[PDB]
Amino acid sequence: MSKGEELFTGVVPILVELDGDVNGHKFSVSGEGEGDATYGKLTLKFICTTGKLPVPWPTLVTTFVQCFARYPDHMKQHDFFKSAMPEGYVQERTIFFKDDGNYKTRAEVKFEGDTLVNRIELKGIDFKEDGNILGHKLEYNYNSHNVYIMADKQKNGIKVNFKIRHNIEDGSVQLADHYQQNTPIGDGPVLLPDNHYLSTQSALSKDPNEKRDHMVLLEFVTAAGITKLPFPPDIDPQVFYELPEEVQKELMAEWE
Numbered sequence: 001m002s003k004g005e006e007l008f009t010g011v012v013p014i015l016v017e018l019d020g021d022v023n024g025h026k027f028s029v030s031g032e033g034e035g036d037a038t039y040g041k042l043t044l045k046f047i048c049t050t051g052k053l054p055v056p057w058p059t060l061v062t063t064f065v066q067c068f069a070r071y072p073d074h075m076k077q078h079d080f081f082k083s084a085m086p087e088g089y090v091q092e093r094t095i096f097f098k099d100d101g102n103y104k105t106r107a108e109v110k111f112e113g114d115t116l117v118n119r120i121e122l123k124g125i126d127f128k129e130d131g132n133i134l135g136h137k138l139e140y141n142y143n144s145h146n147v148y149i150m151a152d153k154q155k156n157g158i159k160v161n162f163k164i165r166h167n168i169e170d171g172s173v174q175l176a177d178h179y180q181q182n183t184p185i186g187d188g189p190v191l192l193p194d195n196h197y198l199s200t201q202s203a204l205s206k207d208p209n210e211k212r213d214h215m216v217l218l219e220f221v222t223a224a225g226i227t228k229l230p231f232p233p234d235i236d237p238q239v240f241y242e243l244p245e246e247v248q249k250e251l252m253a254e255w256e
Contacts (some may be wrong), residue, residue: 001076001192007035007169009066013115014044014192016064022124023101031064035116037082040070040112040221048213055124056138058166061202062095062178063105065118069198071220078193078226080149080158080182081185086111087186092233098175104233110185118161125237126228132166132174134244139167142202148256151192157183158193161255166243179232179255196225197244 001096016031017089033044046057046064053060067081081089088110095103127134147162160180165173184190198221205216229248231240240248 001079002083002189004067004082004231005076005077005079007085007111008035008082010038011036011158011224012068014042014065014118015112015115016044016046016118016120017059018063018120018122020055020122020124022055022122023127023129024104026050027053029053029060029064035065035068037068037070040068042068042217042219042221044217045207046215046217047210052213055133056104056140056166058138058140058142058204059097059103059133059176060122060215061204061217062164062176063103063107063120063122064217065109065116066091066198066221067109067116068219069223071223075196075226077191078149078196078223080148080191080193081109083189083191084182084184084186087184087188089182089184091180091182093178093180094231094233095179096177097127097131097133099128100131100133101125102230102237104237106233108185132168137169138174139169140204140206141167142204143167143199144199147198147200148195149193149196149197150256152181152254153192155181155183156190156192157181159255177230179230179252181233194226196223198223232241 018029027050031046035042038184090108093105103124105122164176202219
């Protein structure tokens with residue numbers, strides 16, 4: 001269904017680089033591993049290269065390559081992510097942690113030679129100093145989620161929405177609402193899909209021999225489904241909050 005699809009038939013090496021700033025606390029993370037879209041499997045190890053990470057590792061899972069999803073044969077014409085390859089796509093999100101701050105991310109996901117690279121900038125603002133995120137109150141674990149995808153024909157891309165459940169050490173749950181958009185970097189044709197979702201599962205672990213602050217991440221992803229107010233990635237939050245609340249709400253309707 002796409003030429004990009006051919007780049008994913010085997011095991012592909014992956015590099016991830018993130019520069020982050022959350023409430024002015026700067027950090028960098030490097031990751032490496034591999035993806036196997038035939039199985040929908042991703043395996044990655046990340047190291048904080050700047051010292052200790054100032055937010056919980058699980059808050060960064062979604063930021064740290066949906067081109068590795070397994071699309072069933074009957075759904076191959078709906079796989080935007082591989083169709084954009086090798087030139088790649090820009091993935092932008094705004095992520096809202098309930099009763100706490102937000103992340104804004106921009107990533108480029110593309111081939112550099114035979115390696116799939118995810119290069120990310122992340123800015124977080126408005127976090128509470130002893131809230132769940134800056135206070136490191138999240139459990140080191142992850143649950144299963146459905147990631148809902150719709151075409152955005154005007155932008156020649158997709159919009160994506162989902163809500164992550166982060167378990168808190170006291171037994172509560174901290175929700176992270178994700179508003180995502182992806183657009184091709186190159187000029188070649190891409191597949192714009194009918195509505196569907198990715199069933200995503202993740203598990204986090206540690207390397208007992210690794211003394212640097214780090215995360216080992218396993219994800220399994222399979223497509224299915226075909227037989228202060230939140231602001232979107234394109235609007236500076238500064239301008240957004242000057243709009244009437246009715247308008248702020250109406251601007252978010254496209255994410256469903």
